[PDB]
Amino acid sequence: AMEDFVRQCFNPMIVELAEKAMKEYGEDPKIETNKFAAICTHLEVCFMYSDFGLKHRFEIIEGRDRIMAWTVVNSICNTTGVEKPKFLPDLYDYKENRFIEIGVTRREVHIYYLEKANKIEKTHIHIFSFTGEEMATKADYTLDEESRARIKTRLFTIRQEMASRSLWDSFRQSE
Numbered sequence: 001a002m003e004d005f006v007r008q009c010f011n012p013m014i015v016e017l018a019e020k021a022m023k024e025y026g027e028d029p030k031i032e033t034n035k036f037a038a039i040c041t042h043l044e045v046c047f048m049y050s051d052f053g054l055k056h057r058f059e060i061i062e063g064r065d066r067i068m069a070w071t072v073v074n075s076i077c078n079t080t081g082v083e084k085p086k087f088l089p090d091l092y093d094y095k096e097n098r099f100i101e102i103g104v105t106r107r108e109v110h111i112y113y114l115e116k117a118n119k120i121e122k123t124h125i126h127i128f129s130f131t132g133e134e135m136a137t138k139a140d141y142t143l144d145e146e147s148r149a150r151i152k153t154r155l156f157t158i159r160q161e162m163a164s165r166s167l168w169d170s171f172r173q174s175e
């Protein structure tokens, strides 16, 4: 089952967070399994991305309840002067001095890029596929190659584990 795989392939903190995220908004991870899998996969990227950092470079925003995430965002604007977003993003960059929206997609990276860019407004956008393909505003990929390489391998691995269990098709197609 998709669901089994999620518990079997993600650190509980991430599963627990993804469950909480879904079940609060009234979604069943036992039914909406592929969303469950996707939500986990996103958090993890986000956490990975965050913790590949000026010792501490990134502010993690995804993961937090909405009260916290907006505190962290309101705190950040007051002290740096960068514009407040209309939509909570995934990260802030304390070096390059901008918020980051992380996209993960099982479609072409340029398509999921444009969707993102459409929704927003001075947020750096960085998209990862599961084919180890990326795309980021002004092709500024924000991170040293070794860090970007770990994400791509992870996402690829998650693709390939799904495919062991005949899941990739379900998942690829439900975006």
Ligand SMILES: CCc1ccccc1-c1cc(=O)c(O)c(C(=O)O)[nH]1
Pocket (backbone or CB within 6 Å): 038, 039, 042, 062, 088, 089, 090, 102, 103, 104
């Ligand atoms: C996490 C995947 C997802 C599925 C359905 C609706 C929204 C989202 C989503 C995608 C994102 O990239 C993202 O940053 C968020 C978010 O809540 O911040 N949500």
Ligand SMILES: [Mn+2]
Pocket (backbone or CB within 6 Å): 062, 088, 089, 090
């Ligand atoms: Mn987000």
Ligand SMILES: [Mn+2]
Pocket (backbone or CB within 6 Å): 042, 090, 101, 102, 103, 104
């Ligand atoms: Mn995101």
